[PDB]
Nucleic acid binder design. Structure first.
Ligand SMILES: *C[C@@](*)(O)[C@H](CCCNC(N)=[NH2+])NC(=O)[C@@H]1CCCN1C(=O)[C@H](N)Cc1ccccc1
Ligand SMILES: *[C@@H]1O[C@H](CO)[C@@H](O)[C@H](O)[C@H]1NC(C)=O
Ligand SMILES: [Cl-]
Ligand SMILES: [Cl-]
Ligand SMILES: [K+]
Ligand code: NA
Ligand SMILES: [Zn+2]
Ligand SMILES: [Zn+2]
Lengths: 250, 27
DNA sequence: GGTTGGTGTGGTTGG
């Protein structure tokens, strides 16, 4: 996260950290959507250009974790993975179209003051919140600048109009993506960066006061560049696939 | 469902330090 | 104690 700030304790209880089991290494962010399911980006699990192709046994997740280094006994929790599901039409060859995966935990995590699930949007929720200008929030343990924080980092960013998103890059954008960030001199800055993939782009609903995950950190070109924008997987657009997986393998 | 409400914030009627910024962008 | 027990030249972990 470039130009964000330290997250207060309990402010993102659905945050999940994805770890390579051996050796222990922090790979990506993720989010908790129920006591047994975790959402993340497909490229965090599968990406051949970087020789990446993980199976359940190779990873583990940490939840309710506030410090990168110390283990907060009885606060953070850990789970191994029972099964991983990547979107069947995930396009890693061209533009990361449908950059999304679900991970089923071996043992459900109990909710607490530091651990709770974020909501997934439904149609009326997506229709009124996903609008150019409205701001969302991104969190993560990724790089602090274009190429490692000790406390989870947070940044608030505005959703950008699709024509602008499309003209800002030569990569083929699709309806399964949305971009966010400030324009060339709206004065402010901020962006997600490498290592933040899988983390949530959330929005607080002004109608029922709940937090909803509208996106997943997916990709960008450099981090926080003038006239560039961060790209995010469009959760609602892929909601039917999410629900069918949970329903069938839950 | 039990989602999207944080025990240390919404359940205690407390705002985090920057959510106001999000709320204002809607108007 | 702590946002968390019962003991550490810590521990899976700081002070
Ligand atoms: C895997 C993630 O941690 C990372 C997130 C980057 C977010 N960056 C910004 N500025 N918001 N994603 C990546 O690094 C993805 C994976 C493949 C490479 N990629 C990029 O984002 C390249 N920088 C661009 C790209 C290359 C090939 C295909 C699509 C995008
Ligand atoms: C990833 O590896 C599995 C076996 O571990 C293989 O079946 C799968 O097709 C691979 N995916 C790739 C490299 O496209
Ligand atoms: Cl390999
Ligand atoms: Cl190898
Ligand atoms: K202790
Ligand atoms: Na930018
Ligand atoms: Zn290899
Ligand atoms: Zn609860």
């Amino acid at each position: 996260i470039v130009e964000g700030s330290d997250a207060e304790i309990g402010m993102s209880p659905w945050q999940v950290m994805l770890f390579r089991k051996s050796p222990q290494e922090l790979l990506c962010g993720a989010s908790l959507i129920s006591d047994r399911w975790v959402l993340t980006a497909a490229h965090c699990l599968l990406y051949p250009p970087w020789d990446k192709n993980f199976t359940e046994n190779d990873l583990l997740v940490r939840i309710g974790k506030h410090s990168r280094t110390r283990y907060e006994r009885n606060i953070e929790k850990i789970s191994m993975l029972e099964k991983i599901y990547i979107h069947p039409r995930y396009n890693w060859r061209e533009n990361l179209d449908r950059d999304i995966a679900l991970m089923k935990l071996k043992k459900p995590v109990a909710f607490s003051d530091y651990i709770h699930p974020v909501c997934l949007p439904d149609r009326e929720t997506a229709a009124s919140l996903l609008q150019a200008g409205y701001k969302g929030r991104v969190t993560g343990w990724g790089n602090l600048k274009e190429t490692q924080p000790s406390v989870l980092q947070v940044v608030n960013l505005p959703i950008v109009e699709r024509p602008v998103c499309k003209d800002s890059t030569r990569i083929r954008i699709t309806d399964n993506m949305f971009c966010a960030g400030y324009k060339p001199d709206e004065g402010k800055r901020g962006d997600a960066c490498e290592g933040d993939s899988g983390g949530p782009f959330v929005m607080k609903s002004p109608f029922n006061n709940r937090w909803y995950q509208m996106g997943i950190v997916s990709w960008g070109e450099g981090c926080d560049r003038d006239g560039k924008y961060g790209f995010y997987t469009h959760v609602f657009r892929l909601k039917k696939w999410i629900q069918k997986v949970i329903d069938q393998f839950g | 469902a039990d989602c999207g409400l944080r025990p240390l914030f919404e359940k205690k009627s407390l705002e985090d330090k920057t959510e106001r910024e999000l709320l204002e962008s809607y108007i």
